[PDB]
Write a protein that binds this ligand. Structure first.
Ligand code: NA
Ligand SMILES: [Zn+2]
Ligand SMILES: [Zn+2]
Ligand SMILES: [Zn+2]
Ligand SMILES: [Zn+2]
Ligand SMILES: [Zn+2]
Ligand SMILES: [Zn+2]
Ligand SMILES: [Zn+2]
Ligand SMILES: [Zn+2]
Ligand SMILES: [Zn+2]
Length: 260
DNA sequence: TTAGCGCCCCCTGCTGGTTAAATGTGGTACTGCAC
DNA sequence: GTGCAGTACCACATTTAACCAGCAGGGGGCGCTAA
């Protein structure tokens, strides 16, 4: 009937030894047995054996099915879920099941809640929900590169990926390709190739039904659709007021605006 | 009494598969101008 | 009007990194009994 009770708090214990351990755990905060490697100490001998095992790497119990030996029996019991499945914990909202309690708690925090505090990157403006995801973001974007990484479009060298990407975003309104015979410039290589074809007079695309050649693919396509396709009729736009037909809509719109 | 043991949890952190935002590609209309 | 020459949409395919559940390591609390 739990005759022994702790006067310092609400806990009541059966035996004297249990109550003494409880006082040491939560009321005296003194640990007699101390780790020899560091300042860590343990009230219970098993806890100190835990730290000594971590200090030395001793793995007592081996998994039956795999190549993992745990240093604590509970770690092996948790590792056995890898083979059995057996997701014990269940979310109370979406009823999803998880192999670990911390996995379920993180799921509830990040999937079923709105005003959750997030982590801000100390080096950039991004805001990340998880600390582990922030560490991944730091370890890739803000990681230092000893050999550097050249810009894709200029001779600038950067050692942080975030800096390189920010610099490369400044070239998105730029016409890298420049013709060697005039001042014309463009952003895609195909346009530069077309312009050099016009400069040289080359007409690579040739009509297979006539003697006419063209410097661009679309010009040949429209020529074939006009003078080699009887079923094609040019789009005619009649004026809104006068009704005069215009092949180009822009001329029709301008005429309608100036029409009386 | 006291250590061994079992259970159970919390806290922290890394990791690949998923996915959504960002960005590059290319087909195809689409206008300005000289004829 | 038209063909040439250059520009402009934009659906689509990569590219990229946050999202997220699956994992393991380090520690703390108690409730049993045997020894
Ligand atoms: Na262009
Ligand atoms: Zn107490
Ligand atoms: Zn230690
Ligand atoms: Zn195993
Ligand atoms: Zn849920
Ligand atoms: Zn950042
Ligand atoms: Zn650059
Ligand atoms: Zn040129
Ligand atoms: Zn033809
Ligand atoms: Zn008119």
């Amino acid at each position: 009937t739990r005759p022994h009770k702790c006067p310092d708090c609400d806990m009541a214990f059966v035996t004297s030894g249990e109550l003494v351990r409880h006082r040491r755990y939560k009321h005296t905060h003194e640990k007699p047995f101390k780790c020899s490697m560091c300042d860590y100490a343990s009230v219970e001998v098993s806890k100190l054996k835990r730290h000594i095992r971590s200090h030395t790497g001793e793995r007592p119990f081996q998994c039956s099915l795999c190549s993992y030996a745990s240093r604590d029996t509970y770690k092996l019991k948790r590792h056995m879920r890898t083979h059995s499945g057996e997701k014990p914990y269940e979310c109370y909202i979406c009823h999803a099941r998880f192999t670990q309690s911390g996995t379920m708690k993180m799921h509830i925090l990040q999937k079923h809640t709105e005003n959750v505090a997030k982590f801000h990157c100390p080096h950039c403006d991004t805001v990340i929900a998880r600390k582990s995801d922030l560490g991944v973001h730091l370890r890739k974007q803000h990681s230092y590169i000893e050999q550097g990484k050249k810009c894709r479009y200029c001779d600038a060298v950067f050692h942080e990926r975030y800096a390189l990407i920010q610099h490369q975003k400044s070239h998105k309104n730029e016409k890298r390709f420049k013709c060697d015979q005039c001042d014309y410039a463009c952003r895609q290589e195909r346009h530069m190739i077309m312009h050099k074809r016009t400069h040289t007079g080359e007409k690579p695309y040739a009509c297979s039904h006539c003697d006419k050649t063209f410097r661009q693919k679309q010009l040949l396509d429209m020529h074939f659709k006009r003078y080699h396709d009887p079923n094609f009729v040019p789009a005619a736009f009649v004026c809104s007021k006068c009704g005069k037909t215009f092949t180009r809509r822009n001329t029709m719109a301008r005429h309608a605006d100036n029409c009386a």
